[PDB]
Amino acid sequence: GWVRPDLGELSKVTKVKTDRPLPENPYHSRARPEPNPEVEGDLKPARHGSRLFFWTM
Amino acid sequence: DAPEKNYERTMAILQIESEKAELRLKELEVRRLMRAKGDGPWFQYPTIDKALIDHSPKATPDN
Ligand SMILES: CCCCCCCCCCCCCCCCCC(=O)OC[C@H](COP(=O)([O-])OC[C@H](O)COP(=O)([O-])OC[C@H](COC(=O)CCCCCCCCCCCCCCCCC)OC(=O)CCCCCCCCCCCCCCCCC)OC(=O)CCCCCCCCCCCCCCCCC
Numbered sequence A: 001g002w003v004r005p006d007l008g009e010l011s012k013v014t015k016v017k018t019d020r021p022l023p024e025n026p027y028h029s030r031a032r033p034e035p036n037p038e039v040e041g042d043l044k045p046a047r048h049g050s051r052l053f054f055w056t057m
Numbered sequence B: 001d002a003p004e005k006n007y008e009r010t011m012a013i014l015q016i017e018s019e020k021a022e023l024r025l026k027e028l029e030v031r032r033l034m035r036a037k038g039d040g041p042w043f044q045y046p047t048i049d050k051a052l053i054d055h056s057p058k059a060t061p062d063n
Helices: B003-037
Strands: none
Touching: none
């Protein structure tokens, strides 16, 4: 009573009902380094201009 | 000019230039620390963007 699969069927992506748990770390990866702090807040102008030796703006 | 005017103008000039000098010293110290530790917004030399990684299931499982 077995029926041969039609063309296109054995290449279907199927779904599997399992009882084993999902691997929370399949790569055995460690903790990632914490990122650099972002930029935030309002942008005030430069204090006393460019401060390049004598340029007052 | 009045001596009051030159005197208080000199105090204004000295405050502005002392602030600029202290800010340049802080600028040197900030640049030294950010080159040394690499934790600030400056000297952030680029690494690989991890948005380029294909996280799809590949052809072989051991990866
Ligand atoms: C109501 C709405 C409208 C409001 C209007 C308000 C304004 C009303 C008046 C309208 C006109 C305004 C003009 C600009 C504002 C005043 C700027 C000024 O005098 O700064 C003083 C500036 C600093 O003096 P200060 O006492 O600290 O500040 C007074 C003000 O607070 C200065 O203010 P500051 O603190 O904001 O200045 C910022 C900063 C202040 O400066 C600094 O922080 C210091 C560093 C400045 C540069 C130094 C470079 C040194 C090495 C290069 C040398 C270059 C060659 C020298 C000259 C060769 C011959 C041309 O300036 C700069 O960084 C700009 C660079 C210098 C250019 C100055 C403006 C020139 C305008 C006309 C251009 C024509 C040619 C001029 C000569 C070209 C060479 C400069 O003086 C100098 O640096 C000495 C150099 C000569 C200055 C130019 C004088 C302008 C008038 C020229 C008329 C004659 C032209 C003759 C024919 C052509 C030449 C043969």
